[PDB]
Each structure stands twice: as C-alpha cells, then as structure tokens.
Amino acid sequence: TAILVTTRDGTRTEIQAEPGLSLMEALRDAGIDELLALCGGCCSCATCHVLVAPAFADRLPALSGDENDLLDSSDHRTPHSRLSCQITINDKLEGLEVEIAPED
Amino acid sequence: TAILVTTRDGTRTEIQAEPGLSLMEALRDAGIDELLALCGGCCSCATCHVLVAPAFADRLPALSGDENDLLDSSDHRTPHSRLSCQITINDKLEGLEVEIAPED
Amino acid sequence: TAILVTTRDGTRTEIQAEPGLSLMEALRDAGIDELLALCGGCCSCATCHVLVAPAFADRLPALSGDENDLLDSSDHRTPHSRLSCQITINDKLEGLEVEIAPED
Amino acid sequence: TAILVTTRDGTRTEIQAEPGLSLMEALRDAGIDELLALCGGCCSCATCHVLVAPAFADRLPALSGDENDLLDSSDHRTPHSRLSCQITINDKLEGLEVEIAPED
Amino acid sequence: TAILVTTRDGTRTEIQAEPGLSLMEALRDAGIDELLALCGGCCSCATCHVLVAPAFADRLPALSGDENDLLDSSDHRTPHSRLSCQITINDKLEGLEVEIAPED
Amino acid sequence: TAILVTTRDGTRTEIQAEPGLSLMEALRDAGIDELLALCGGCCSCATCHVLVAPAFADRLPALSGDENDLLDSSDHRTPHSRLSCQITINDKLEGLEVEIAPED
Amino acid sequence: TAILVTTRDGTRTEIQAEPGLSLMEALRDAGIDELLALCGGCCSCATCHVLVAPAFADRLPALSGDENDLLDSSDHRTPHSRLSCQITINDKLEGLEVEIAPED
Amino acid sequence: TAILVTTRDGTRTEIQAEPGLSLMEALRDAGIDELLALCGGCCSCATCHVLVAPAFADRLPALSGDENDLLDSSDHRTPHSRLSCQITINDKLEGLEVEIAPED
Amino acid sequence: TAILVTTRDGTRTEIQAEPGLSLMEALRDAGIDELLALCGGCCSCATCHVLVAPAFADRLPALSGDENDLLDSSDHRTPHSRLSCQITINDKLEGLEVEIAPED
Amino acid sequence: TAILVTTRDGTRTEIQAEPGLSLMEALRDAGIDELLALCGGCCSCATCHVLVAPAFADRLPALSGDENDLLDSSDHRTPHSRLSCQITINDKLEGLEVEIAPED
C-alpha cells in the first residue's frame, strides 16, 4: 500500500509497498538506497531507523525491547522513532508518512 | 483476511482477521479463548504459541531471537512454532493455516 | 482483600490481604511460613511461586519477561504460575484462589 | 481511586482510577493522551515515564531492574521517576500525585 | 564453489555456491528446501544447523559465542555443528562437505 | 554497630546499626530519610549509593559485577562508591564512615 | 561466631567464624577443605554451594539473581541452597546450621 | 583478491587478500601494523575497526549484534563501520575500499 | 613447562610447554590433535575442555564466569574442568596433570 | 619477572613478580598501593586498570569480552589498557612496562 517517504535531504516520494514485506524491504525495493540495512533486517543495528508520523503511532504494532534498545543508541531517536525492518506492511498503514532518520 | 485455525481438540475453524492486528489478537477477537496470552502480547511468555503450516513459513516475518528463546521453553516447539503475538495480519497471510500449540 | 490460599499439604486458609502490598508479603504476613521469599521480593528467585486459579488470569497484570524466565526454572511451572511477589493486592483480586507451588 | 496528575504544561487535574489497572491505563482511560505508551505497557520503552511525588515513594512497589534501565535512557529521569505501566492502581495510592515526564 | 551436501535421508548431492553468499543461502538457492532459515540468517535460531566434516574445520572461521549458544539448544549438536548462515562461501571452501542436521 | 554518616549537606552523625541488616536498612532505620531505596535493596537501582571512606575498603566484601554496573550509571560514582544495600552490618564495620552520594 | 557445619560425610563440626569474612572463607580457615572455591569467591561458580537449615533462612541476606542462576546449574540445589562466598558472617548468624552440598 | 586500504595517515595501498581469511588477518599479513587486534579476532574488542566505502556495503555479510555493540563503543564509528576480523575474504570483495578507523 | 597430559584413550605423554602460551596452544603445539579449539581460543566454545588434577586447582588462576558458563554446557563437566585455552602457561604449573575431557 | 611499573605520579620502580600470580597481585605484593582492587580480582570492576607499553601487547594473551566491557567504562581507557588482575605473570613478560591508569 501507499507510503510517503521523506529522505534525509528533504525530498519526498510516494511508494507502493507490498503487504507482508517489512517497511525496510519496501523502502529498499523502491530504491531508497540511502537506508542501509546493515544487519539485514534482523533487529541488530540502528541503520533502518525512520521517524514515523505521530498520527500513525496507533496503527503500528508495539515496539519490542530489543528495537527500543537499538533505537536508544541513536542520537536522533525521538518518541516516534521506529526500526523500519520491524514494521510489517499491511492495509492499516495506507498513507503512512515516514522520514529516514539522520545518520547514526 | 481468512485464516484456518486448528484448536487443541483438533477441530478446524475459519476466522476473519483484520489486517494490522497480531494473529494472537485476531484469534481472541474471533472467540478462540484457548490461547492464553499471559504477557498480553509483549513477547515475554510462550502461551500464545502456534504451529504454522510449513507452506506458509516464508510468508511470515523472520522470527526474532527473543521469540526463539521463548519457544525453546516449550516441550511442544517444532521448527514451525511461532508466537502468534509476533505475527502481524496482512493479505499475504490470506489462507494461513495455524494450529494452537498444546499447553506448556 | 480476601484471598484463599492452599498450602503444599492441601490445607486451605482464608486471609485478609492489605491493598498495595504484594501477594508474597500478604501471604507471609498471614503466617504462610512455607513460602520462602529468598530474594526478598526482588524478582530474582522462584521461591514465591504460586499457582493462580484460571478464573483469575484476566484479573492479574501481565507477567514480565524476568518473572517468566524465573518461573521456567521450576519443574512445576504451569501456564497459571505466578511469582507472588510480582502481584500487587487490590480489590480486583477479591476472592483470589492460589496454591503455593510444590518445592523447586 | 483519586489521582492528581500534572500534565506537561504544568496544569493539574484529578482523575478516577480503577483498582487493578496500571497507572498508564488509568491515565489514558481518563483522557490524558499526552502519555504515549509505545510498547503498549510491556516494560520495553520509556514513554510512559512519570514523576511521582516523594511522599508516595514508599506506597509503590519496588522498581525493577528492567524498569530502572529503561528510565536511565531518559534525560529527565529523577530518583522519583517511574514507568506508569509498572504501577498497579490500589486504594493505598488514594490521593497519589504524579507528573507526566517531559518528552524523551 | 562446489559443496557436497548430505541431506537428512543420507543422500549426497553436489551443489554450486557463489562466493559471498552464506552457506545457508547457497544451500537454499540450490534447492535444498529441507533447510529452514526461520530467522532469515540473522543468527537467532538453530534451523540452519549443519554438520561440517571434521577435515574442513580448520578452513572455516571461528564460531562466535552467539552461534555456539544457539547450537547448544539443539539435541543433535556435535562439536562440528555450525549454523550455515554464519559461513561465508569462498574458494578455500572448495569441496566442503556438510550434512543437514536432524530436526529440533 | 557504630557508623558515622555524612549526609548530603555535609553534616556528620553517628548511628547504631544492628548486625545482619544491610547498611541501607540501618541508615534508613536510624532515620537518614535522604537515602532512597527505590528498588527495596534488591540491587536493581542506584539510589542507595554511598561513598565509603578509603580506609574501610579492605573491611568490606568485594563488590559484584551487578553492583559495579549500577554504580556506573551515576555521575558521582567514585572508585569508593558502594550500594549500601549490598553491605551487611558486622562488627568488623565498627566505626565505618560513609557519605551519602549526591543525587542521580 | 559459631557455625555448625555438616560435611559431605554426614558428620558435623562447630567452627568459629570471624565477623566480616564470608562463610566460604570462614569454612576454609576452619579447615573444611571439601569446599572448593574454584572462582575464589567472586560469584562465578557453584563450588562453594551450601544448604542452609530452614530455621535460618530469615537470618541471611536476600539471595541475588546471579547467585540464583549459578545455583540452578547444580543438580543438588534446593530452595535453601546458598553460595557460602555470598554470605557475610555476623552475630545474627550465631548458631547457623549449614551442610556442604554434594559435589556437582 | 584485491583490497584498497587507506591507512590512518590518509595514504592508500592495494593488497592481495587470500580467500577464506578475515579482513583483519589479510590486512596484518600485508603488513598493516597500524591495526591492532587486541582480542585476536574473536569479536570482543573494537581495535580491528575499519570504515567500509559506501559502494561496498551490499557486498559484505550482514552486521551481527555483537559486532554492532562493540562498534558503538568507538567515538569514530559511522554507519559504514565494520570490525575487519568479522569479514571473510572472498571474490565478491574484489576491489573493496576500506579505511582504518582512527584509534579509540 | 612439564605437563602430564592424559588423552581420551588413556595414553599419557609428558610435554614441554612454553610460558605465555595457553594450555590449549601448548597441547596443540605438542601435537595433541584430539583437542579441537573450535572457537580458536576466544572462550566461546567448550571444545578445549580439560580435567585438571585436584592437587593443582590452587595453582591455576580463578575461572571466569564466562568460562564457567561454557563448561556447564558439557555433559562431562566436573568441579575440576577448565577450558585449556584460558590457562596461561607458567612455571607454577610445572608438572601439571590434565586429562582431555570426553567429547560433548 | 622484571616489571617496569610507572605509578600515577610518574615514579618508575622496577619490580620482581612471581610466575602464576596476577599482575595486580604482583603490583600489590611489591607494595604499589595506588592500585585498588575493589572487586578482589574477579574481573568485575575497573580499578586494577593499567596501560601496557605497545611493544608488549603481542606478549600478553588476548583480552576477554568481559575485560573489554569493564575497561570501556573508564574515561582513561586506551587501546593498550588492560585489567592487571587478568594478566598471569610469566617469563614471556620479562621486562614488561606498565603505567597505572589515572583513577576513574
């Protein structure tokens, strides 16, 4: 379904995201090459970090402790930070707005 | 989204499951009360344990290390075991078959 | 409030339990001397283990991962096992039935 | 059960809180939306962070190590900080004063 | 690049394996579907477990502590067990012999 | 049994301390209310932090790794910092001098 | 101060233990050579394992999580098991009855 | 196979690296003595730290959690940081550009 | 430098061992090939497992928590088990008796 | 056996050190009292911190993950920092240069 992604430089792109892939996988499939996924989507790094629009907090599954810990390593973490590889694409995310987190 | 659950007594029932809920939530919502979810779906127990049909293995997100350790506590873990509170409902799961794992 | 406690030997006792203390503290205040609380109610042992009546599962707060891990060390753990030092007494526990878990 | 909450803007409002719910649940239920509870009350984030009036310190259960580590991630932790999803409402909390911690 | 795999039935088949892939990926690409990778090759499960012929032990990088702990959870671990997703394919692996570990 | 405590304001007071109690318990019983024990003396917080006069270091049991990690979370840790709840009162502690560590 | 120790042969000695030492150190200074302290009293093995007489449980400091974990590795652990290097000798232990745990 | 390594002085060498070795071992056999391997390549220090040229990120195996944790201890970590003892040399690394990370 | 090494089959070589090396390193250098060192002596496996003669325990340094943890995974662990890779060769070990632990 | 120890103030004793002892033990036995060994050499503090001369790194055994973790807590840690209690004295250390790390 449709996700609006803002990259680090401010440019915005609408992407069509397949249900059942992770947000990280959808972003990379759409050529958002800047989103390193160094651990390969196994929740062991912070490089798939995105900032989720506050309106959408309720539409995402709860974050885990491991995801929370990894997000804390980043100096750009906010209450709305998520690891994109932890978010499964589904219809309830239709219209999701995310920003790629600044580096580190 | 239609899901076929085998309950502990071996009987099979199809349920509807809203995209974006966890499988555990979809299960309880549809009146499958067998499944305790003692930790309330926060990946801290093994009481939402399901067995997933092999044909669906690759349609689900990778299991996490925390999910994997919780499942090892169960004498009924098989390699198709999942914690259903770790699975987000989405159309790629259309037709999923799960069995409620025996108790313990 | 009122808790019905069965000891290891099968004898049953009604106790009046003060709100805000833990179940372990209430049990010990009532002279259930057999319930060792070796760590002192700091969730680091399994010796305040009780079996909670299934009817009451919904009336207790969710168990944590640490409590869950410690309960797994016990060969007598069941899906309804709780560490009594993790349960805060309050009106919603009125009539709670618990059994002191067998030793280990 | 009557609880006096100071919201982020410094204003004070008394709420009713049902015994057996967590403080975080009592807060949201009474329309205090300020408090995100990203992890959904499973002790895996720091977004339900409250500051408890000192006079009430000893009326609450001991904080856990997992709660303590989560709170250290916040630049606003004080020694009276608690995760409100870790506090069970009960009559001993009658008259509790809490302040919603600033964001981060 | 050429690797001889002994499947669970005991039959032996030679496969080609691209350098830079993991052994797990290579086995899976060559259609050894037997071998589940529940965690997706992120070293958090034990389903990619293979048994490495003793004569190649020297040719493999040191196993890590994390890999070692996951292998101990299997009843079929031997001192030559490896997680195939931890092994990078390179020419020093020419002719490697591995057996698919039994399930669980 | 006699211990000289320097409170946060810098004043010194001698207290009596029963053997077998923890230092934290003794300080609290003698009314040094300054000293919070948020975790209840279960070595899971840093609020019972005291600074031990160098001349008594030898007379105290070795600090544990867990105690060491909790002390590092305080900005006022020194190499003579101890968690007072980890210290058992005994006659070898006669005349022990401790300062209440500053907050946080 | 006086400790009654039952050695592995079932025989028992009353020893004098100096306040401030650990039970492990007291035992060894009294010549109970049975008792290995492989890690040398830093809570990293289970070789200083003793069984505490039920009547004295109350008289010792709370069990730690690390001590609890180490003790679970022993086939001879009971709910009254303690690591003797974790117990500080003091007047409250006067007349303590302990038994050296069988080996393993 | 050919690796272009930039040393801490900013100068750069093309080395030959034998397939199957780690990058750390390759580097050292080529005489890049700058690079300490304090723990000797068992993933327990951060002294074999290198920065991988962005174009090659894809060409390495996934980052592990342990490698991720170690790297965060370094003030010079960037999202392209890798521990060179964790990288197995293979044809897919042909022309790899790496820079030895500053010390610390 | 003299070590009495008893192998799995029962043969008893005496060997010279160079100070500063690990016992595992010594056993391999003297060509005792039985002793796999799967993790390459970075204290992450149990394959360098030996049984030390009781007379010598006190002449080795204290085992670590990590070494103790690895050793407990072995079904042949005894209170005298050591990971040979963790023992630095020195003159105080003159004439040490070790047996190679059975595999697993 | 000869160690060139430089203290915090800059004075440079040379000392004899007995094989089999830890470097910390040696420094204390030669009466270098600066070096607190708060945890009694069980690798749980950072107070036995020394700085090894770069010429000697390769003559010491690999540091452990645990030692590395403790050392990172020190604001004076350098890539040459070692916990002196973790270094077994042996002839290969003949003429080792160490500086006592500044406190904290």
Ligand code: FES
């Ligand atoms: S890609 Fe590494 S945590 Fe998401």
Ligand code: FES
């Ligand atoms: S409900 Fe506890 S892990 Fe799913």
Ligand code: FES
């Ligand atoms: S008393 Fe130890 S866990 Fe409850």
Ligand code: FES
């Ligand atoms: S809501 Fe996440 S810890 Fe309370």
Ligand code: FES
């Ligand atoms: S696929 Fe899970 S560990 Fe290899």
Ligand code: FES
């Ligand atoms: S009171 Fe929490 S650690 Fe001492």
Ligand code: FES
């Ligand atoms: S001596 Fe090792 S734990 Fe007591």
Ligand code: FES
């Ligand atoms: S050498 Fe220590 S982590 Fe690479």
Ligand code: FES
């Ligand atoms: S070689 Fe793996 S622990 Fe000794």
Ligand code: FES
């Ligand atoms: S003395 Fe504490 S780690 Fe060396």
